[PDB]
Amino acid sequence: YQTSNFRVQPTESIVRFPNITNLCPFGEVFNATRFASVYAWNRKRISNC
Amino acid sequence: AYSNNSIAIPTNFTISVTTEILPVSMTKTSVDCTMYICGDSTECSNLLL
């Protein structure tokens, strides 16, 4: 009789994501010396990062 | 030709060998229902039962 099919169950889980390397200066506004006025506020455009 | 008093009898013969090819059996196959849905997952087994 062919009663079943078998498979080895996994021991643990493995999750790998690609490198975040070659980062953009997202901390430029964080380490900036002086900002502008509250009405003069600057908007940092972050694209392809 | 067709006549009442006429008859044809063979004066010589020949031995001919022909070929008929007759299949007997086919390939034995068995398909699993669970592995056909997916393996290594309990979602296929609970929804399949």
Curated annotation (Swiss-Prot), chain B:
- Record the organism: Severe acute respiratory syndrome coronavirus 2 (2019-nCoV)
Q: Which residues of the full protein are shown?
A: 706 to 754 of 1273
Q: Which gene encodes it?
A: S
Highest rank taxon of the organism: Viruses
Glycosylated residues in this chain: N4, N12
Cysteine-cysteine disulfides: C38-C44
Q: What does this protein do?
A: Precursor of the fusion protein processed in the biosynthesis of the S protein and the formation of virus particle. Mediates fusion of the virion and cellular membranes by functioning as a class I viral fusion protein. Contains two viral fusion peptides that are unmasked after cleavage. The S2/S2' cleavage occurs during virus entry at the cell membrane by host TMPRSS2 or during endocytosis by host CSTL.
Spell out the protein name for this chain.
Spike protein S2
